Design a protein around this ligand. Structure first.
Ligand SMILES: *[C@@H]1O[C@H](CO)[C@@H](O[C@@H]2O[C@H](CO)[C@@H](O)[C@H](O[C@@H]3O[C@H](CO)[C@@H](O)[C@H](O)[C@@H]3O)[C@H]2NC(C)=O)[C@H](O)[C@H]1NC(C)=O
Ligand SMILES: *[C@@H]1O[C@H](CO)[C@@H](O[C@@H]2O[C@H](CO)[C@@H](O)[C@H](O)[C@H]2NC(C)=O)[C@H](O)[C@H]1NC(C)=O
Ligand SMILES: *[C@@H]1O[C@H](CO)[C@@H](O)[C@H](O)[C@H]1NC(C)=O
Ligand SMILES: *[C@H]1O[C@H](CO)[C@H](O)[C@H](O)[C@H]1NC(C)=O
Ligand SMILES: [Ca+2]
Ligand SMILES: [Ca+2]
Ligand SMILES: [Ca+2]
Ligand SMILES: [Ca+2]
Ligand SMILES: [Ca+2]
Ligand SMILES: [Ca+2]
Lengths: 78, 70, 531
């Protein structure tokens, strides 16, 4: 084990906490960017996960392929 | 080698496989394994001498710091 | 000289039938190749008693919803719900609701929309951005509309036969390697200028844009093994400015000894590593830009590794094998997750290039099948771009055009990169020509941050969304650690000072061989910059 401020990767190598959720893998098993709180945007809007921009309830569930993933009509419109 | 006298044997020659103690040269030729990194050009273009900082020698051979076996 | 069958030109001579606006002046005043009467004079108004259908097919209302297709795409039958007890005022249809003569409401999807496929009387917007070559650089979707926006560093410039976006800087140079010399060529100035000379057995070229920001890029080049002497990977500065012949280029070997035929070389500008593929050694390996810490990367199932490429944005390397089993394989820069992209309908895949600015699409040149094809980086949507390419040897992509070398002709050829239009010839050089490469900064995105945290001891290779540690060949990690390796570190290699005389003047070696310029008329400074 190591210090309180160091996040431990499953293999035993422990990295600083600042490198959690930093946008880059650092663990060989990617665990520092896995299990990390996903992005979100303000009320009535949605973030298309594939490109990461705020889109409105005009286009989520507009019956068609408004997000770059094409997936709103099943992943949002459940 | 031209044996017939008219190169009949060597025409359309497919290079042979190497056997268990032979190394296949760059230009598809087989030589004794003991000729690899022996401080001499045996494959015609020193292709045997290529990149032997990263291999051990035979049990009875001493290895120079340059990778050659003596 | 009657308009319905003969084009009456301005000079009072008339032109027979289809010759009007065919691409060659049959009139003799230039107006034969003009818009006038030949180019789109009428746009077909149709009445309440017709439907001008989905594709412009105008058909009588009696045929609309009669259960017999006139329109071709069956759009005169779309919906076709029937009963005079029904009106458009009940609003079943999502958008262009209309009333028919028989049996009540009938409704079209708006131009730029198709019927919902899960139901009739409902329509989706077409995502036109999925169509290949609909926009030059970027596409944004809207309800039956889109925009051909282009990314930062590209000014929108209206052009002939469509709009494109400019280079926002100095016109691109081509690099043209021959066995004895590398040559430059300004695509706008259209002049050769001297560069690396008195060399021998050159084969391939890549560059790093201005690593020290002192206004000098560096090109890496390969020398083949000859007779009984090994090859080399060597590197030298090249001016980004207009200077040449007056600047003695000094070659330096990286010291990567035991090297035979490096037919493929690529420089990772983000990871500061150089990737090359030795055909004779049957491997593709990596080392730092100065030639230290050599590590074999991929050594299995390689017959004859051809030209390679790297995409630091996606952390994916690409390479081609032109042996008995031709294939195009991609992998991480670390060397894990090796996979085969395309292995069918392949001849001699010998030149490969990635379109960074267009969905990171991959193009390659086949010198045996005589074709150039493009595939998405994951390997779906294969389409031949240009055929009858006269055996392309090498290719590179820049702006809205694709460049290649027609090998035995020694010619450099150019074409729309989306497969449209017709081929163009740029210039003619020796059959010793072995590449074309566009020397420009927009060609390699310089604002791609290296994810490495300096943690790695010797090498910090890239991988998708991160990095990884490695150490030279014939060494291993210190037990229990995945960062430090037992091999002794080596100091970085010092590159000799370059010659820098921009607007003119001649370089000169002083007592300690430091370069110095004799400034020309009307210019001053240590490097003759301002005057
Ligand atoms: C070369 O690569 C760089 C990235 O290394 C590209 O820069 C990014 O381009 C996008 C395009 O629209 C911008 O949004 C990025 O700005 C950033 O956006 C995020 C949200 O997605 C914000 O959190 C940031 O604050 C910032 O606004 C931009 N990123 C950076 C670091 O510049 C660039 O487009 C690309 N260029 C070419 C020619 O390919
Ligand atoms: C390639 O040619 C172009 C001209 O077609 C050069 O661009 C000009 O270069 C001069 C050099 O003093 C500048 O002052 C001008 O402003 C440039 N004009 C344009 C249109 O931008 C370019 O420098 C040449 N490049 C090389 C290396 O030869
Ligand atoms: C519906 O179709 C007609 C052609 O029949 C067209 O002129 C009109 O603009 C469309 N409606 C809207 C709201 O655009
Ligand atoms: C060293 O290389 C020689 C020659 O190939 C033998 O293969 C030997 O077994 C190797 N030694 C070790 C310890 O791997
Ligand atoms: Ca991290
Ligand atoms: Ca939608
Ligand atoms: Ca030998
Ligand atoms: Ca004509
Ligand atoms: Ca009909
Ligand atoms: Ca659209």
């Amino acid at each position: 084990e190591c210090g309180s401020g160091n996040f431990r990767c499953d293999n035993g190598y422990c990295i600083p906490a600042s490198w959690r959720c930093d946008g880059t893998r650092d663990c060989l098993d990617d665990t520092d960017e896995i299990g990390c709180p996903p992005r979100s945007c303000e009320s009535g809007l949605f973030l298309c996960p594939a490109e990461g921009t705020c889109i409105p309830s005009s286009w989520v569930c507009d019956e068609d392929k408004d997000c770059s993933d094409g997936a709103d009509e099943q992943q949002n419109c459940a | 080698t031209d044996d017939c006298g008219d190169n009949s044997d060597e025409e359309n020659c497919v290079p042979r496989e190497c056997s268990e103690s032979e190394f296949r040269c760059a230009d598809q030729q087989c030589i004794p394994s003991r000729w690899v990194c022996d401080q001499e050009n045996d494959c015609g273009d020193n292709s045997d001498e290529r990149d032997c900082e990263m291999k051990t020698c035979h049990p009875e051979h001493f290895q120079c710091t340059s990778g050659h076996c003596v | 000289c009657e308009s319905p069958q003969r084009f009456r030109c301005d000079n009072s001579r008339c032109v027979y039938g289809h010759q009007l606006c065919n691409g060659v002046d049959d009139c003799g005043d230039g107006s034969d190749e003009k818009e006038e009467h030949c180019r789109k004079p009428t746009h077909k108004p149709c009445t309440d008693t017709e439907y001008k259908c989905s594709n412009g097919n105008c058909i009588s209302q009696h045929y609309v919803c009669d259960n017999v297709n006139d329109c071709g795409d069956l759009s005169d039958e779309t919906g076709c719900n029937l009963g005079d007890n029904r009106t458009c005022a009940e609003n079943i249809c999502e958008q262009n609701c209309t009333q028919l003569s028989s049996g009540g409401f009938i409704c079209s999807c708006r131009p730029g929309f198709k019927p919902s496929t899960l139901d009739k009387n409902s329509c989706q917007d077409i995502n036109e951005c999925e169509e290949f070559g609909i926009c030059p650089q970027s596409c944004r979707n809207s309800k039956g509309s889109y925009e051909c926006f282009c990314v930062d560093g590209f000014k929108s410039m209206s052009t002939h036969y469509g709009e494109r976006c400019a280079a926002d800087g100095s016109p691109p140079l081509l690099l043209l390697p021959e066995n004895v010399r590398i040559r430059k060529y300004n695509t706008s100035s259209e002049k050769f200028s001297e560069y690396l000379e008195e060399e021998e057995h050159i084969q391939t070229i890549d560059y790093d844009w201005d690593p020290e920001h002192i206004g000098l890029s560096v090109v890496y080049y390969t020398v083949l093994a000859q007779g009984s002497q090994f090859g080399a990977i060597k590197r030298a500065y090249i001016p980004n400015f207009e200077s040449g012949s007056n600047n003695p280029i000094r070659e330096v070997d990286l010291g990567l000894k035991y090297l035979m035929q490096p037919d493929g070389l690529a420089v990772d500008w983000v990871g500061r590593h150089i990737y090359w593929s030795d055909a004779k050694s049957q491997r593709i390996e990596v080392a730092t830009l100065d030639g230290r810490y050599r590590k074999w990367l991929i050594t299995t199932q390689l017959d004859q590794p051809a030209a390679i490429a790297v995409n630091p944005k996606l952390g994916l390397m690409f390479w081609t094998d032109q042996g008995k089993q031709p294939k195009i394989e991609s992998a991480w820069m670390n060397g894990e997750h090796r996979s085969v992209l395309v292995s069918e309908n392949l001849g001699w895949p010998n030149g490969l290039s990635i379109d960074y600015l267009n969905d990171d699409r991959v193009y390659w040149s086949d010198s045996k099948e005589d074709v150039i094809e493009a595939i998405k980086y994951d390997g779906t949507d294969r389409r031949l771009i240009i055929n009858e390419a006269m055996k392309p040897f090498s290719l590179d992509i820049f702006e809205d055009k694709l460049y290649w070398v027609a090998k035995e002709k020694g010619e450099v050829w150019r074409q729309n990169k989306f497969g449209k239009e017709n081929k163009e010839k740029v210039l003619v050089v020796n059959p010793w020509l072995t590449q074309v490469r566009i020397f420009h900064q927009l060609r390699y995105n310089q604002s791609v941050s290296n994810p490495c945290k300096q943690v790695c001891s010797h090498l910090c290779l890239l991988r998708p969304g991160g990095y990884s540690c490695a150490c030279p060949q014939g060494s291993d990690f210190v037990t229990g650690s995945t960062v430090q390796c037992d091999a002794a570190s080596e100091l970085p290699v010092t590159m000799p000072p370059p010659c820098r005389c921009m607007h003119g003047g001649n370089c000169y070696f002083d007592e300690n061989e430091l370069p110095k310029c004799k400034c020309s008329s009307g210019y001053s400074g240590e490097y003759c910059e301002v005057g």
